[PDB]
Design a protein around this ligand. Structure first.
Ligand SMILES: [Ca+2]
Ligand SMILES: [Ca+2]
Lengths: 164, 486, 698, 659
């Protein structure tokens, strides 16, 4: 509801995302009849207001209960990313750790920025990682930029999937 | 495409109806202006607006809301500049030169306040535009007044079986005049000469949204979204349905062609009708049009002015150049009907065995649910389900409890909550239940609070049971969602 | 509605006020016009074109031109009055009258009733009965026009007389009978019918700011039938006439403003007028008449403008434009060749030492008036030719506010004010063919001085004509007829060995609208009013003393300063004393308060209008915003256009409050120039009670 | 004439951001920006589009001629968005990082695809349908208006760049053909036919130029908010329909510029565009005001007054048979003086007073003129006027001096025209070896040292005592805008060495020397240490500016996500009337807004500093290129661009020094 990023507001029917009839195929919402495969990204509709969303079963528009927004090994504040980003053998593994285990997209993006600085901007992996960090932070155009800049360097399946 | 849009304005306020929207050269020198007596946004500021070309030039304030504003002629010998007669309550205002000129009032007959609700004019001798036109009016007090073309003497009072809503008139005064008054009581009445009672009624079945008089046949638009063509005699001739709600209609005309059809405004942003032979009156519009007036505006003879719902203003110039889906059965179907044709007895026996086992297991699980009172629907007719609303460390748990019986209340009931006293904090676990009136849903709220500092969910059971007894009449279960709190 | 399409007739030289007349000769009437060049020409439209019926060799400046007959005979005898005489021609041009009527300076008005003559002057007024001196009068104020009621529909001979100080002095014989009040200086007045009204006599005057009235003057009391007070059409009423254009049949009123507007009023109400035709002419429409001059049968208006373009507006509506422009092609060929010939001749004569370059003198029609609704003078220049540029040089802090109707382009030079005296230097260019130039000048309360205007026309030998105007010290006051005597009046009395002429000339130098001629009586009282905030300045003075009672306090200070300065300019050694009421300063503060409050409220509203629009663009502003801001949304345009001027009002009010503080404590005795900035932040906070406490405490 | 149609739109249009074009292919529509970073499309209702960014240039055109639909290019100050509309897809989305101040769409010269050439702060980029940077160059200052006009025939359209430097530069792809020195920032440009194009400044002066020749111009009181060539009387020759600040829409001729058609709107004029709108196979004239009123059109006494003025002049010349002598003449000497001003003394021939002086010059003054007005006690036969032009541009002073006596009402107006030559402030002095600027450029010239001396006398204010022998010689000049120094050294070998510490001064001198000797190519050996060190400092700082902005944007995205979560949570707590938790959410929202506002302040501060640094870099590349005439210019420009895209700063300075 509160994140608006689509350019158009009344796009032509057929050019935006926003069969058996409900007399045959069951439905989860008014439209979007039941599917055959649940991925953790299926929507099957969109709740209009915030009142319409809190007052609805928590797994009506998602494949898991809907939210309001979407000892330790090493201490993130302690280690200085400026030092790890000088050596990529440690840098890539440590970034994967910070981004996928600790889920701290900010320190991850800091490490990725420093590491891309070090590698002089000519390796697609750090570009795709920065793009993933941006996409997590909600900046879809600053992430599209990095995915596009990575596709120009090495065309790989992952970059096409991220960019789509 | 058959119209040239001269002006399609979107954000000027104009709220008038096709009865109070008249066009004439109220000043002279052969150039036509458009008078519209409108109430403004609502019944606050009725102001006669005059339009000349593309933009407003003057809005005269009115005392009350104009029920109509009709233009007629007032000089048979050497016609002068015609004036505009507007109506407001018991007052009729004659405006010569679009200036406040004269005021006449209805004869107060037992203060008792009367109102005029519709005006329409009718010719005198020759049935042309160069002759004079006698006025017709309808009142809320059940009268219809045919007056001299200049409104200084009452010429014909007439009684109406019901309050009128729309008027129309045909014919010549002395020879014969036909006064079609479409009333609010769901009917029309054609009043003719020397009627102590109107003597002519016609049913339609509802209240009409308008009417149009073509040369011979008469047209009426039904509130149920249709057009019905009658004859003046009283016999229905033809009917047609409209794909939207009829907002307003008027009498289109084109003397260089001879086509005289109906302009029906619809709620689907369209004007649409099927004439006798040709397919005309087909025009779209951004916003639903509420008033229409086809006439000679400025200098051209085929202008069409329209006022839509949300104010606005539309001007269109008319150009003079006017099998079944039976499925397909693949090889799988034939192979399997073959295996059933050969070995149907094994399938039948194994299905009967599996069905006996299924009845056994279902009776087993049903007896267990009866035993543990786990059913939220099962004398003592009750039903209960629970809803959790909220995503934070506090949830509104609302129990919808309903007594489902013909007529008997349920007095002694209580609700208990069985929960984890570590994870959840319910203020009132046990509470009584009001007298459940049969047929009514009682929503009983509670506030659960997640006490777990991490994200830990757990079930919450709700037992509805009588006070005296100790066996739950029924139970409900609620999987409390994750905290998402702190 | 009236649509009198325009048409042009012969163009004559530059003309004065009401110097065009329609001789009836229902056929086309024939026009007669004067000119600043002595030519007085009569002509007419025959079949659409002009014919010079007759013309007189140039003499003096034709300041007035009326038509009358000796008896009640058809009034065809045309009387003009050029310098100080009166010439009189018959309708065919044969002269029959030459009255010397030797005056002092010149003639600026005249009226003929049969043979009776009423001729005015700067101050002198005379009445003759067939050139025999019968009555004389010397009004203390300038005269604008003179009229006489119809001595036939009425019995006696009671001539009205319009004075420039907003009083109609209805006099009989050689003494004033009584007075009438009029809002605005009356410049024209005429009987509002071909006879003067069915109800005996009826006057119809027009003022200088634009206003008309129907003062019916009885034997001893004037009754105001009604009045037109201009609502949006400010301008000097130069000429009026009665004529029935609309089909109502009785009669209508035609009036010509100074900016060019030509208005028509009808009396369908039987008491009140209504406007029918409002059309501008881009000059000073100096004379108006109704009738038919060409293509008889159709009614029309004939208007003579300032440059001499005798145009008409007719009632009836290609192959003529090309014809006129081809005739003009021939004319331009011949005339351009002739003028280039003597252009080269004059250049050939530009190498001789004995030779001396003459000058092409021209006439400018300036009008330096004071607007009352605002506090801004309105300077209006006019030239018969087209202006090439106008310079505006000043010695006073002055705000040349740009007006909308203007089209010139300004260039404010970087005035010094230290090496020279130029506190302001501006330049308007008028890069078109412009005749008139209207421009605002906003003055401050205490500063005074000269204001020059260098006007250059588009005549080939280029010349610049300088015109000087005066910004008086108290240049924001204006004369009124009465004051309130209950308000706190901080009086000031000065006594010395000056004469009456000296004190009167000082007051003229200080007060805006006082006539310079020392009044006869040696004891004179002028009641003024401050046009920015209502504070009167009742000034009563004699040969020996002067008293100036004024609601305001700062006006007393300015009067004291300027009067002492003049006395020391002549070394009179006057003594000045003053008496100040303690509630007067609080009263002036109570007057100033609402304006400051309104300005600050408007500022705090324009602070929010922007964000409010930013939100309504998204939401629509019908469902989320509390109407305390929906009001702001509806008034946004007004808020913006008035915040365009808000800071000027703020600076004026702040300077005024500062000077009021200074002068209050100066009359108390001390100087507070140290604490002068200390009140600025108080004004920025502006608690009314705290402000008054600041005034009375420190 | 009369508006063929008139529609009132429910939104407020942005001034220059209006375009029209067929977006469905067979249905023209009107695109126009709006406040709150939106764009609406009138289809024949209105369809909105969320840019969420202050548009600065909008345009429709054919970006790929394979299909027919028109792309909609919405240039934000920091973006660029081609956007198919019939499909909710975009043709590309680039970030220019310099700006989008003016955009024009069309085929450049000798390029095979319709570009999307754009312009911001000292930058010019042109893209294809895919978004590839094909065209790139750098101009003097900020670009305010671009146009695609075809000079010198050849059929291949060049580009017109209206800089804030007051100039109109014509850029053939990779070249700079000509420049036209105007007087104000060129805020509108439009091509009519061939090499005719109309320009609109900020003085309000609208004009028409043919291949560097100006046919006409007016200077009104309002500002031309838009101009557009369009035929209105059906002659083939198109008029120049301009929309003024008050609402006056005027269609004027192009041969002389006299008003043919006139109309008025309710508010200021935003856009005037051409395009079929009623679907009847004929182009029209759509005019859109700021208030949202759009309307579509389809295609005497003054001469008698001037005749009467001729008669008046006849009368004046015949009557002779405030008077003044007939041999009165004005001698004006334009010198320079230190004790900071180019002095112009106007003097009369014989005891006649110079009462007031009007100077009409283009951009030298604040305003359009300058009035000297000596006080009554300062009236003499001579008056000295100080002038301080802000740019080394030759200007023509149109003097109108008033001659007359001490007490007069009508003075004579003697008109004159003098010229402040280019490089007027710099005054000839004596050399000071202690304060000679260490910066220097050397280059070669053809011959004729005396021709260079005549160049000096033409483009400098030398005193009359001067004299220069053919031997090698040094001429020094103290600047009068600042106390700088200039040293021109002409060697006997025919070499030239300019020793000014200002680089723009060296560029101006070398370019004037080139254009004076009809030179098509020139290469310099240049060195400006003081400027180069500062440029290196800025280039160093740019990277850290980038990093700080990245970190701040990350943090602000985090906090914005937090704030949206808290909005949802507060709505939830309020829907169950739980007021303690609702008030706690509202407190947390207040605190987060305070922190985010601090972050916004610091981010915008660093961002404006970043824009300053980028403009410094681009202007430095342009200053390097501008120092060399001809084919070396774009060579140095592209070389520096490639040396900065690879962060090879040392190579950048190497190619700026000698290359
Ligand atoms: Ca070319
Ligand atoms: Ca043409």
């Amino acid at each position: 509801i509160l994140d608006e990023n689509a350019i158009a507001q009344v796009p032509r029917p057929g050019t935006s995302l926003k069969g058996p009839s409900p007399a045959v195929r069951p439905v989860t919402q008014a439209g979007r009849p039941i599917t055959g495969f649940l991925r953790p990204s299926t929507q099957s509709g969109r709740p209009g207001t915030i009142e319409q969303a809190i007052k609805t079963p928590r797994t009506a528009y998602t494949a898991r209960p809907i939210a309001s927004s979407s000892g330790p090994f090493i201490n993130l504040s302690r280690l200085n990313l400026a030092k790890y980003a000088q050596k990529p053998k440690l840098a890539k593994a440590l970034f994967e750790y910070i981004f996928h285990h600790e889920n701290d997209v900010k320190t991850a993006l800091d490490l990725a920025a420093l590491s891309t600085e070090h590698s002089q901007y000519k390796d697609w992996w750090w570009k795709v990682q920065i793009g993933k960090c941006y996409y997590r932070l909600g900046l879809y155009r600053e992430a599209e930029k990095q995915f596009k800049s990575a596709l120009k360097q090495q065309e790989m399946v992952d970059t096409f999937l991220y960019l789509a | 495409s058959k119209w040239l849009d001269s002006l399609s304005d979107s954000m000027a306020n104009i709220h008038t109806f096709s009865a109070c929207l008249a066009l004439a050269d109220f000043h002279g020198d052969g150039e036509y202006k458009l008078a519209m007596g409108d109430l403004g946004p609502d019944g606050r500021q009725p102001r006669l607006k005059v339009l000349k070309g593309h933009t407003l030039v003057s809005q005269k304030p009115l005392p009350d809301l104009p029920a109509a504003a009709v233009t007629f002629l007032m000089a048979s010998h050497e016609p002068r500049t015609p004036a505009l007669a507007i109506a407001s309550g018991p007052c009729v205002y004659v405006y010569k030169n679009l200036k406040p000129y004269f005021k006449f009032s209805l004869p107060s007959l037992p203060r008792r306040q009367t109102v005029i609700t519709t005006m329409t004019t009718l010719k005198k001798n020759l049935a042309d535009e160069d002759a004079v036109s006698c006025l017709v009016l309808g009142t809320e007090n059940k009268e219809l007044l045919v007056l001299d073309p200049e409104a200084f003497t009452i010429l014909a009072k007439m009684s109406l079986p019901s309050v009128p809503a729309f008027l129309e008139a045909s014919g010549q005064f002395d020879v014969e005049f036909r006064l079609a008054a479409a009333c609010r009581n769901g009917s029309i009445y054609i009043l003719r000469r020397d009627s102590k009672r109107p003597k002519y009624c016609i049913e339609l079945g509802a209240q009409p949204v308008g009417l149009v008089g073509v040369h011979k046949v008469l047209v009426v638009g039904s509130n149920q979204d249709s057009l019905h063509g009658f004859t003046y005699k009283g016999k229905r001739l033809w009917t047609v349905q409209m794909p939207a709600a009829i907002l307003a209609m008027n009498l289109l005309e084109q003397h260089s062609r001879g086509l005289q059809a109906v302009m029906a405004a619809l709620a689907n942003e369209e004007v649409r009708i099927y004439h006798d032979k040709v397919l005309l009156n087909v025009i779209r519009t951004p916003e639903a049009v509420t008033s229409l007036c086809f006439g000679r505006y400025g200098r051209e003879d085929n202008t069409l002015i329209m006022t839509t719902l949300g104010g606005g203003l539309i001007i269109k110039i008319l150009k003079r150049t006017a099998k079944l889906n039976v499925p397909r059965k693949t090889r799988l179907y034939v192979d399997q009907t073959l295996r059933e044709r050969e070995a149907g007895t094994a399938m039948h026996r194994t299905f009967q065995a599996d069905l006996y086992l299924l009845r056994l297991r279902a009776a087993r699980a049903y007896v267990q649910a009866l035993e543990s009172s786990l059913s939220p629907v099962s004398r003592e007719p009750l039903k209960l389900h629970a809803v959790v609303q909220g995503l934070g460390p506090t949830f509104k748990l609302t129990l919808h409890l309903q007594n489902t019986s013909t007529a008997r209340p349920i007095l002694g009931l209580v609700v208990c909550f069985l929960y984890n006293e570590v994870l959840y904090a319910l203020p009132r676990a046990f509470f009584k239940v009001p007298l459940l009136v049969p047929g009514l849903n009682y929503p009983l709220e509670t506030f659960v609070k997640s006490l777990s500092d991490k994200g830990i969910s757990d079930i919450i059971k709700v037992l509805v049971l009588r006070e005296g007894q100790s066996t739950p009449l029924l139970s409900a279960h609620i999987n409390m969602p994750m905290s998402e709190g702190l | 509605d009236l649509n009198l399409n325009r048409a042009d007739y012969l163009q004559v030289g530059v003309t004065s006020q009401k110097t065009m007349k329609l001789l009836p000769a229902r056929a086309t009437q024939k026009v007669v016009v004067g000119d600043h060049d002595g030519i007085v020409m009569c002509f007419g439209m025959k079949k659409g074109e002009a014919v010079t019926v007759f013309k007189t060799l140039p003499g003096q400046k034709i300041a007035r031109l009326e038509l009358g007959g000796a008896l009640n005979t058809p009034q065809e005898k045309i009387f003009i009055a050029a310098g100080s005489e009166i010439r009189g021609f018959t309708k065919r041009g044969k002269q029959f009258l030459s009255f010397e009527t030797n005056l002092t300076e010149s003639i600026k008005a005249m009226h003929i009733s049969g043979s009776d003559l009423f001729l005015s002057a700067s101050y002198i007024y005379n009445h003759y009965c067939d050139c025999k001196d019968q009555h004389y009068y010397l009004s203390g104020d300038k005269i604008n026009d003179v009229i006489c009621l119809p001595v036939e529909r009425l019995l006696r001979e009671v001539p009205v007389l319009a004075c420039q100080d907003r009083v109609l002095r209805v006099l009989q014989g050689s003494d004033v009978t009584y007075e009438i009040e009029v809002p605005g200086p009356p410049t024209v007045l005429a009987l509002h019918n071909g006879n003067g009204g069915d109800s005996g006599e009826d006057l119809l005057f027009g003022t200088s700011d634009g206003k008309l009235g129907l003062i019916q003057i009885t034997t001893s009391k004037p009754i105001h039938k009604w009045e037109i007070r201009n609502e949006k059409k400010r301008g000097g009423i130069l000429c009026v006439d009665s004529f029935d254009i609309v089909g109502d049949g009785v009669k209508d009123l035609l009036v010509g403003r100074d900016d060019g507007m030509v208005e028509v009023y009808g009396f369908d109400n039987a008491n009140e007028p209504v406007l029918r035709f409002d059309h501008t002419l881009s000059e000073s429409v100096t004379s108006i008449q109704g009738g038919c001059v060409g293509k008889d049968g159709y009614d029309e208006i004939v208007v003579s403008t300032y440059s001499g373009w005798i145009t008409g507006l007719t009632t009836e509506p290609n192959q003529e434009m090309q014809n006129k422009i081809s005739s003009l092609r021939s004319e331009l060929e011949q005339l351009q060749y002739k003028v280039l010939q003597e252009r080269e001749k004059y250049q050939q004569s530009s190498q001789s030492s004995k030779a001396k370059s003459a000058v092409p003198s021209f006439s400018v029609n300036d009008k330096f008036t004071l607007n009352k609704d605002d506090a801004s003078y309105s300077l209006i220049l006019e030239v018969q030719t087209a202006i090439d540029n106008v310079l505006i040089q000043s010695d006073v802090p002055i705000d040349l506010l740009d007006v909308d109707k203007n089209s010139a382009v300004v260039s404010f030079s970087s005035c010094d004010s230290e090496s020279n005296d130029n506190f302001l230097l501006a330049t308007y260019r008028c890069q078109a063919n412009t005749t008139r130039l209207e421009l605002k000048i906003r003055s401050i309360e205490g500063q005074y001085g000269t204001l020059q205007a260098y006007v250059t026309p588009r005549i080939q030998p280029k010349t610049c004509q300088v015109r000087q105007y005066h910004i008086k010290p108290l240049s924001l006051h204006q004369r009124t007829h009465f004051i309130d005597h209950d308000r706190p009046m901080n009086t000031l009395t000065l006594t010395g060995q000056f004469s009456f002429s000296e004190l009167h000339s000082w007051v003229v130098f200080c007060m805006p609208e006082v006539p310079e001629k020392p009044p006869a009586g040696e004891c004179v009282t002028f009641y003024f009013q401050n046009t920015f905030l209502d504070t009167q300045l009742e000034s009563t003075y004699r040969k020996g003393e002067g008293v100036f009672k004024s609601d305001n306090i700062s006006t007393i200070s300015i009067l004291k300063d300027v009067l002492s300065k003049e006395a020391t300019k002549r070394k009179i050694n006057l003594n000045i004393s003053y008496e100040i009421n303690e509630v007067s300063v609080k009263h002036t503060l109570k007057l100033i308060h609402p304006k400051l409050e309104y300005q600050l409220l408007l500022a705090k509203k324009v602070q929010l209008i922007d964000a409010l629009k930013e939100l309504q663009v998204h939401e629509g502003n019908t469902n989320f915003l509390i109407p305390e801001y929906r009001c702001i949304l509806e008034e946004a345009d007004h808020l913006q256009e008035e915040y365009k001027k808000q800071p000027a009002h703020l600076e004026r009010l702040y300077g005024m409050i500062t000077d009021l503080f200074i002068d209050k404590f100066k009359f108390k005795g001390t100087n507070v120039k140290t604490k002068v900035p200390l009140l600025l932040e108080i004004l920025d906070s502006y608690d009314q009670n705290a402000l008054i406490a600041f005034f009375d405490a420190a | 004439l009369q508006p063929v149609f008139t529609l009132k739109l429910r939104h407020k249009i942005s001034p220059r951001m209006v375009a029209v074009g067929r977006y469905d292919g067979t249905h023209p529509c009107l695109a126009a920006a709006t406040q709150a970073g939106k764009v609406f499309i009138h289809n024949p209702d209105v369809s909105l589009l969320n840019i969420n960014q202050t548009v600065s240039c909008l345009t429709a055109g054919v970006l790929n001629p394979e299909l027919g639909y028109d792309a909609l290019l919405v240039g934000t100050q920091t973006n660029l968005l081609a956007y198919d509309v019939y499909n909710n897809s975009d043709l590309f989305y680039r970030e220019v990082a310099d700006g989008a101040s003016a955009i024009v769409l069309g085929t450049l010269g000798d390029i095979t695809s319709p570009l999307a050439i754009i312009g911001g702060n000292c930058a010019l980029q042109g893209f294809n349908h895919e978004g590839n940077d094909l065209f790139w160059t750098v101009t003097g200052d900020n670009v305010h208006s671009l146009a695609l006009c075809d000079f010198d025939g050849d059929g291949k359209k060049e580009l017109l760049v209206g800089s804030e430097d007051f100039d109109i530069r014509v850029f053939k792809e990779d070249e700079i053909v000509a420049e036209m020195s105007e007087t104000e920032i060129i805020t509108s440009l439009c091509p009519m036919y061939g090499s005719r194009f109309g320009y609109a400044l900020s003085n309000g002066t609208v004009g028409v130029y043919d291949k560097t020749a100006r046919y006409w111009r007016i200077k009104s009181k309002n500002q031309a908010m838009s101009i557009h060539a369009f035929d209105l009387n059906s002659d083939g020759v198109c008029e120049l329909i301009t929309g003024w600040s008050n609402g006056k829409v005027d269609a004027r001729s192009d041969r002389t510029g006299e008003v043919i058609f006139k109309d008025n709107f309710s508010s200021a004029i935003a856009g005037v565009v051409e395009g079929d709108y009623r679907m009847e196979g004929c182009q029209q004239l759509i005019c859109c005001s700021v208030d949202g009123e759009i309307r579509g059109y389809l295609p005497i006494r003054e001469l008698s007054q001037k005749k009467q003025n001729l008669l008046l002049e006849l009368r004046n010349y015949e009557e002779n048979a405030g008077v003044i002598p007939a041999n009165t003449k004005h001698h004006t000497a334009l010198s320079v003086s230190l004790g900071a001003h180019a002095e112009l003394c106007i003097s009369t021939s014989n005891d006649t007073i110079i009462r007031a002086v009007l100077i009409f010059a283009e951009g030298v003054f604040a305003g359009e003129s300058h009035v000297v007005h000596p006080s009554v006690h300062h009236l003499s036969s001579s008056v000295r006027i100080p002038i301080t032009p802000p740019k080394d541009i030759p200007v023509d002073l149109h003097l109108k001096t008033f001659v007359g006596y001490r007490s007069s009402t009508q003075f004579h107006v003697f008109e004159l025209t003098r010229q402040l030559p280019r490089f007027s402030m710099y005054a000839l002095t004596s050399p000071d070896p202690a304060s000679e600027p260490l910066s220097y450029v050397n280059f070669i010239i053809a011959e004729r040292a005396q021709r260079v001396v005549m160049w000096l006398n033409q483009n400098f204010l030398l005193p009359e005592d001067t004299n220069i022998q053919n031997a090698p010689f040094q001429v020094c000049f103290t600047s009068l805008r600042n106390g700088g120094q200039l040293y021109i050294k002409i060697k006997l070998s025919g070499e030239i060495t300019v020793n000014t510490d200002d680089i723009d001064l060296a560029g101006d001198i070398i370019q004037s020397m080139a254009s004076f000797f009809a030179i098509e190519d020139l290469q310099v050996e240049a060195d400006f240490p003081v400027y180069f060190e500062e440029l290196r400092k800025v280039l160093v700082k740019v990277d850290e500016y980038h990093s700080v902005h990245q970190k701040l944007s990350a943090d602000m995205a985090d906090n914005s996500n937090l704030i949206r979560s808290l909005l949802v949570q507060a709505e939830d707590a309020r829907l169950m009337r739980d007021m303690k938790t609702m008030k706690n959410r509202y407190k947390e929202l207040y605190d987060l807004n305070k922190d985010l506002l601090n972050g916004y302040k610091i981010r915008c501060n660093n961002h404006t500093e970043l824009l300053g640094s980028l403009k410094a870099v681009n202007q430095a590349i342009q200053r390097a290129g501008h120092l060399r005439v001809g084919k070396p210019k774009n060579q140095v420009i592209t070389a520096c661009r490639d040396a900065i895209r690879s962060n090879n700063i040392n190579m950048l300075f190497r190619i700026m020094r000698v290359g």
